Design a binder for these strands. Structure first.
Ligand SMILES: [K+]
Ligand SMILES: [K+]
Ligand SMILES: [K+]
Ligand SMILES: [Mg+2]
Ligand SMILES: [Mg+2]
Ligand SMILES: [Mg+2]
Ligand SMILES: [Mg+2]
Length: 69
RNA sequence: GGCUCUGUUUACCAGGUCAGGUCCGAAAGGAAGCAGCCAAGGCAGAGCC
């Protein structure tokens, strides 16, 4: 379960936008998204880095649930 | 070394086109710009000079 799976699953638009600014490697392994990539993704999606942090957290909470359920 | 062909590789760090998202505007209209793709660069094989 990665960001591609989360992608398929104005807030929803904002969330898809952040994923749209990512490279395929970032969507496949979100853990590689550190400071520099967050900044690139944020500016590229018209968001603030804090918005990218919230999206990544939500993705993480979902991945954790899927791993279980 | 150079050029060409072919394969492959490359988040951002002055290229092009820029979906989505963003920004300015009441609108008409504009703008910046990530991903992708393209170009280009990296690593090689081959050919030519
Ligand atoms: K090549
Ligand atoms: K682009
Ligand atoms: K952009
Ligand atoms: Mg680039
Ligand atoms: Mg550009
Ligand atoms: Mg648009
Ligand atoms: Mg408006």
């Amino acid at each position: 379960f990665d960001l591609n799976d989360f992608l398929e699953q104005k807030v929803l638009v904002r969330m898809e936008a952040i994923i749209n600014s990512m490279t395929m490697k970032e969507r496949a392994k979100p853990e590689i998204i550190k400071g520099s990539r967050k900044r690139r993704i944020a500016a590229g999606s018209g968001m603030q880095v804090q918005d990218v942090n919230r999206l990544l957290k939500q993705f993480d909470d979902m991945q954790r649930m899927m791993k279980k359920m």
